[PDB]
Amino acid sequence: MLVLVLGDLHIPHRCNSLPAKFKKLLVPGKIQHILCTGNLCTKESYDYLKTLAGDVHIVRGDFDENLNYPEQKVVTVGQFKIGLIHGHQVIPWGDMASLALLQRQFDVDILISGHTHKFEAFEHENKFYINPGSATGAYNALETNIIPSFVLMDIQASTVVTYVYQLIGDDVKVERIEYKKS
Numbered sequence: 001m002l003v004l005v006l007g008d009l010h011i012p013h014r015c016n017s018l019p020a021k022f023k024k025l026l027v028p029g030k031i032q033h034i035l036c037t038g039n040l041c042t043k044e045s046y047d048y049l050k051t052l053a054g055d056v057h058i059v060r061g062d063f064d065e066n067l068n069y070p071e072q073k074v075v076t077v078g079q080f081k082i083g084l085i086h087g088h089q090v091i092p093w094g095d096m097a098s099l100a101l102l103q104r105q106f107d108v109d110i111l112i113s114g115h116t117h118k119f120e121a122f123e124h125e126n127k128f129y130i131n132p133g134s135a136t137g138a139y140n141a142l143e144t145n146i147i148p149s150f151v152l153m154d155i156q157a158s159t160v161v162t163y164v165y166q167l168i169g170d171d172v173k174v175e176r177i178e179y180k181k182s
């Protein structure tokens with residue numbers, strides 16, 4: 001069962017729409033789940049996504065005006081606990097109460113967040129971490145040379161393969177990753 005992990009689009013603000021070369025691999029009736037790290041910044045996009053799959057999970061990010069979007073979802077997909085948070089939040093450490101509701105977010109197998117726009121994926125101590133980067137390769141306060149990416153995930157048994165699509169000029173190069181959990 002296959003999962004589209006993406007987000008940080010910023011449409012239409014930090015680009016006019018999805019990179020053509022991308023929407024060309026996003027076909028409806030292929031993706032079971034979508035986990036979106038927020039920042040579509042519009043309805044247009046929510047519906048585009050709702051087409052590729054029915055199971056859409058999106059979370060409220062920085063300045064996301066929709067309030068029916070939870071600040072943090074924890075979704076089970078197969079036997080995988082998958083945390084999902086926009087990733088701007090940054091929780092004041094010294095607020096211990098705030099901290100304790102985070103041992104929920106850390107107690108997951110896949111951690112997804114975004115907002116940084118810099119892609120990122122890896123294993124660490126029998127947990128997988130993922131920032132799907134920006135699907136529209138949008139800019140933030142820092143730099144501007146930022147590779148558009150998104151991640152698909154094949155979840156089966158206790159194995160997850162994570163495909164990282166990133167648009168690097170002309171090509172679209174796919175980094176494949178085998179997360180297995182003991």
Ligand SMILES: [Zn+2]
Pocket residue numbers: 008009010039115117
């Ligand atoms: Zn963003």
Ligand SMILES: [Zn+2]
Pocket residue numbers: 010011013014039040041
């Ligand atoms: Zn925006």
Ligand SMILES: [Zn+2]
Pocket residue numbers: 033055057075076
């Ligand atoms: Zn779901």
Ligand SMILES: [Zn+2]
Pocket residue numbers: 008039061062086088114115116
């Ligand atoms: Zn953000």
